[PDB]
Design a protein around this ligand. Sequence first.
Ligand code: 42H
Length: 423
Amino acid sequence: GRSALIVAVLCYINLLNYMDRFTVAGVLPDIEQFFNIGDSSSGLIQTVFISSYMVLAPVFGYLGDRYNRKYLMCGGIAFWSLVTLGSSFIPGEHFWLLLLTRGLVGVGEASYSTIAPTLIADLFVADQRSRMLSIFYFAIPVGSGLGYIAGSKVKDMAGDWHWALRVTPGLGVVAVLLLFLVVREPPRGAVERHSDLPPLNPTSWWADLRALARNPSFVLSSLGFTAVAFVTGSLALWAPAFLLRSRVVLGETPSSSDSLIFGLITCLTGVLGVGLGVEISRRLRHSNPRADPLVCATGLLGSAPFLFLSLACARGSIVATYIFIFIGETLLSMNWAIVADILLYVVIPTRRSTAEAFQIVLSHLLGDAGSPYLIGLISDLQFSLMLCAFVGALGGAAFLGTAIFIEADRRRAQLHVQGLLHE
Ligand SMILES: CCCCCCCC/C=C\CCCCCCCC(=O)OC[C@@H](O)COP(=O)(O)OCC[N+](C)(C)C
């Protein structure tokens, strides 16, 4: 009864998190005009954000494995909300202030995104964990899309680009108050372990890193998740320009309507993919214990041919291409929630924050330092799509390799929880 309200609070804070991530991307051309900057500086904003995020994710993993998770989350939320509200007041003489404030936003969001799913892990069990993680990753893409559209509409109505950063910090003191009042910090593995036992002690951090590098299920699911994130990021970067150029060749248009249509499509396939993936994995898991990574691999390698045929279909019509991309993105998007589950049952509750931090670092590094840096390098159009398909096939092989090792690793972790094995 109280854990449902905790899940509602965490879903709301996740929606706010991605809203604050994308509210500056929904206002980008007026930023490019205000500070007198070219094309590279928007990529510099996003690069500073993701770099601070990746560098400060391991620190908050190490802190959330050993200290009060609710206090660190409250501090992170208060920090990024305060620095956003302060970043609203930057004059046009200094752009590096905007860069530094984006870095601090990245720090706070790294804190929250590293620590938050461990509470959902420690409050529920298998199927209910799967459904509440489904709600969490329902909250991410609606948050991103609504943040873009809210920044854009607030800038259009108010007339100043600064007001795009003034909408989100007002909904941040509410999240801090809710996280202080409603959420109560659960023990590390309260439902995976009886209450009469002494609490589990966190060992050294080097032992945590060696133990997280010695199990193959977690590493291979992280590599599959990395490949999926790379494929989706490159596709979202490439698709609107491709559809515009297709309508240029046909002659319909000699970036607003197609952009909003593709944004609606991305949001709807995100929520439908998370829902369908959790549903199929929960259905199949009872008759097959290795069904989560198999469903991940089926989603990835069954999304591959729909996108592969959309390029051939785009010459004839547009509606069939839209439909086929809508069908492929769902199978691309099951993997978020299913990979979050696969992480949260193969890792000891004294290592889940470090596992989330390592997964964040690996995924964001090999996806976002690679796609806008190598896709644009090899593009300047079919070899980029062939590289995308090769990475997708490698991710499918990684998810099958996860399916080989998921039983032994889940058993070893659940026996380590019960104290029957000692490291
Ligand atoms: C039981 C229910 C209890 C409470 C219910 C509340 C739950 C959540 C509340 C409200 C959300 C509903 C509104 C629908 C959201 C749809 C999002 C939406 O329509 O977004 C508009 C699109 O334009 C966003 O996509 P873009 O940002 O363009 O794509 C990115 C392009 N890029 C180049 C910048 C990378």
